[PDB]
UniProtKB/Swiss-Prot annotation:
The gene is HDGFL2. Widely expressed. High expression is found in heart, skeletal muscle, ovary and testis. Overexpression is frequently observed in hepatocellular carcinoma samples. Residues 7-64 form the PWWP domain. Transmembrane segments: none annotated. It comes from the Eukaryota. This is Hepatoma-derived growth factor-related protein 2. Belongs to the HDGF family. Acts as an epigenetic regulator of myogenesis in cooperation with DPF3a (isoform 2 of DPF3/BAF45C). Associates with the BAF complex via its interaction with DPF3a and HDGFL2-DPF3a activate myogenic genes by increasing chromatin accessibility through recruitment of SMARCA4/BRG1/BAF190A (ATPase subunit of the BAF complex) to myogenic gene promoters. Promotes the repair of DNA double-strand breaks (DSBs) through the homologous recombination pathway by facilitating the recruitment of the DNA endonuclease RBBP8 to the DSBs. It is found in: Nucleus; Cytoplasm. Interacts with HDGF. Interacts with trimethylated 'Lys-36' of histone H3 (H3K36me3). Interacts with trimethylated 'Lys-79' of histone H3 (H3K79me3), but has higher affinity for H3K36me3. Interacts with IWS1. Interacts with H2AX, POGZ, RBBP8 and CBX1. Interacts with histones H3K9me3, H3K27me3 and H3K36me2. Interacts with DPF3a (isoform 2 of DPF3/BAF45C). Interacts with SMARCA4/BRG1/BAF190A, SMARCC1/BAF155 and SMARCD1/BAF60A in a DPF3a-dependent manner.
Length: 93
């Protein structure tokens, strides 16, 4: 049975106006800015951008990859597909 989301989990994350996007739940470094309540820090592969999202916009990657893991015209998306498949827990800083 599913647990709550935790740092390191792999997802497709949905933002308004963008396709479901390969991403991970990030940790928060000591001294770093914390997300709002009920929000997680999402790192988006390919773009390497961070936004704060709740579970309604988070699709676990294993279940969802057949549907959402296909190339997209959008900037950074196909780099992002490589990262989530090949080195999803690397430093991209
Ligand atoms: C992670 C992380 C944060 C830091 C900074 C700089 C030195 C002390 N800290 S802090 C202000 O206590 O977060 N080092 O590693």
């Amino acid at each position: 049975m599913p647990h709550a989301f935790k740092p390191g989990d792999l997802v497709f994350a949905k933002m308004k106006g963008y396709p479901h996007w390969p991403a991970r739940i990030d940790d928060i470094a000591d001294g770093a800015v914390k997300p709002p309540p009920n929000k997680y820090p999402i790192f988006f592969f390919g773009t390497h951008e961070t936004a704060f999202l709740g579970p309604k916009d988070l699709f676990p990657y294993d279940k969802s990859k057949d549907k959402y893991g296909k190339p997209n015209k959008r900037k950074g998306f196909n780099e992002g597909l490589w990262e989530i498949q090949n080195n999803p827990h690397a430093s991209y800083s």
